[PDB]
Structure 1
């Protein structure tokens, strides 16, 4: 029996690698994806072999991540519960996609991940796995073992020679998420110094910085006149937005499995892209199309948040969003200053910005008012 483990190189997946070998008397193939966490994945791959993996794989997936998951999501204007730009949410389908592919190639009957039984990640990983390979076997150790606390887990790792290192973090090219520990009290502000991807607004440059972002067909293709690949472009905007402290959100969200959770997120590049997109859309999209689009975005957002990426509903809505986004061609000009992003200009080759006479308005108004006047007369 072989098992493809989503291995991040940390303590838990290291413990998991050992636990899987003994518990399932299985050969474990480790997989570590480079999605912009800011770590040398090769070090994780080598730790996996030291830990006991029969094979360890590491892949640079930053470009596939931005082009095939982040970009399509952004085209939809996806925002969960008013603020969450879904940084962790869209990255999970990508990881599981490769787990299942590797499982196929290696002849493995199962896959494993270290997401807990109380979060969203477990759902995202498994819904994707099942959607792509229906008879795949999934093993989620957190829902199968009986560790009674951290102490017991550190003891288990020390016993296997696994080296042992106030909140939980998840970082990738789109954002860095923070939750748990001290963050659990929604009345308490995050502690100073917690953020890593964005500069503290109180420490941002004293002068504002202008940035231009070009969109061609619904996707951003250039920054300040320089054409950049998907991953390179997000990276650049992260650098630019980050220096100014842009993209910080603090919310109490509703998880898919039932409870509320306090989360903090920094999405510098994606936040600039959100406003840049809407800026270009303001000139290229039709009024009714836009209004219909905005009423569907929230639904799309929850699909991503819940884990229904490789699902027919999401694919169907994507057909609508992509259609609409094809008209988003132009340039947005933004002004960045101490934590904030300001749209300051926009232009487009086929802008709809700027015939009748005042007289037509009276008619328009009379007809629009008819049903209201009738209703009024009936009330008498």
Structure 2
């Protein structure tokens, strides 16, 4: 049994402690009911978190045996850049892409918080991830990959938990009786999960497809869909060296975390990268989200532009196929499985290491931008090599191309004969050419 349905009284239980009402009440309750809760807070560079240092302090106030802030920023940005290099994004609508920011965050917090628990002798995680979402499965897999002895306590399996803390009103009351005046956040018409890479908005009013971005207050950028909001055009240059983003606007960043924070600032002024997606959850049911990822979106445009100037068609085709495959694995919580490693490493090496260069863009509102310049010592784009002005340098002659065309004849005849066979066998209608039957 991996999933414990009852409070592990007398045992150490690790809590991924965000400091919200759910984890605050749960930690107090676990302590009051006889377990030994340990709090672990991940520093994920959340755009909406103004004071990570205060969270472990509150955990101790609520009865944590010990409370740690685990810095996950560098790992989050490293995994995000790997996802970018491998195009590991499978959710899109007319090309507008979701950058799998929650999946990446979960890969980083599942592994790193469970590792922190393991170094404290904590082999039980009290994980509140719901029975209907994706995160319960992601955390389950990342946790067991990291600690094979891990057990997971699901408080919603525990009737004692549902009976006392069955809701927000009950939780807040529970805290009050213990002498803590929990100050709830202002109610919103949706639910938000965020990290430095991006933010996701879902549930509540966003469950209705008649609602959309118009009801969202963005937390990583501005409300560009409000015509009253003023957004100044801005030019930005993004430089890559061997696939790693290294400079913005001519300023070099030794720290990729600082680079992403600046990329977020730049994209954020425009609302660059926001999208609305209906996606398929792991359990084969659909959900709807509104997404923000301004910095990754900026880096994605630049990276993709350089890929299109540097790589051949087969290479781009494999990159894109692999990316869609990898995105789905990432979403499923399989980012560290062998089949994911294969796809990720392929891109990190043969695709990304050739990506050295700069792209200059003008950002306006939302996903309206213009490309201004593309530079790279590695471009294979080189119109002068196709120049025919001077035959002394021309790469091929008219006669050469004629030869190339002639080689196509036998297979053309074969295709023509197929069309006649397809008419004879009833698949195509008789005829310029036979037509597909509708």
What's the TM-score, normalizing by structure 2? 0.82
Alignment partner, residue 22 of structure 2: 12
Q: Is the 8 A contact 1:37 1:173 kept in 2?
A: yes
- Residues 141 and 361 from structure 1, CA distance in 2 versus in 1: closer, same or farther, beyond 3 angstroms? farther
Question: Match for 1:352 among 380, 387, 402?
Answer: 380
Counterpart contact for 2:39–2:66, Cα < 8 Å: yes
Give the corresponding residue for 1:104.
118
For the aligned residue pairs, the C-alpha RMSD in angstroms reads 1.9
1:1-380 alignment to 2 at 5 Å? 1-22=11-32, 25-38=34-47, 39=49, 40-67=51-78, 69-82=79-92, 83-144=97-158, 145-147=161-163, 148-162=166-180, 163-165=182-184, 166-192=189-215, 194-201=217-224, 202=227, 205-228=230-253, 229-323=255-349, 324-339=351-366, 340-354=368-382, 355-377=395-417, 379=420
Cα shift at 1:72: 0.7
Following TM superposition, by how much is the alpha carbon of 1:48 offset from its aligned partner in structure 2, in angstroms?
0.4
Partner SS, residue 126 of structure 1:
helix
Contact 2:21-2:168 at 8 Å conserved across structures: no
CA distance in 1, matches of 2:179, 2:324: 47
Closer, same or farther: CA 48–360 of 1 in aligned 2, 3 Å: same
| Whole-Å separation in 2 of the counterparts to 1:103 and 1:272 | 36
1:206 CA displacement: 5.0
Shift of the 161–312 alpha-carbon distance from structure 1 to 2, 3 Å rule, reads farther
Stretch deviating more after TM superposition (219-228 or 369-378) = 369-378
Instruction: Answer yes or no: is the 8 Å Cα contact 2:220–2:292 preserved in 1.
Output: yes
Unaligned ranges ≥5, structure 2:
1-10, 383-394, 422-438
State the SS of the aligned residue for 1:41: coil
Residue 161 to residue 167, structure 1, CA distance change in 2 (3 Å): farther
Q: So what's the TM-score if we normalise by structure 1?
A: 0.93
**Rg larger in 1 or in 2?**
2
- Is this contact kept in 2: 1:204–1:245, CA < 8 A? no
Cα distance in 2 for partners of 1:140, 1:276 equals: 43
Shift of 1:149: 4.1
Matched-pair contact (CA < 8 Å) for 1:205–1:244: no
1:250–1:264 Cα contact (<8 Å) kept:
yes
Contact in 1 for aligned 2:231/2:269 (Cα 8 Å) = no
Structure 1 gap segments, 5+ residues each: none
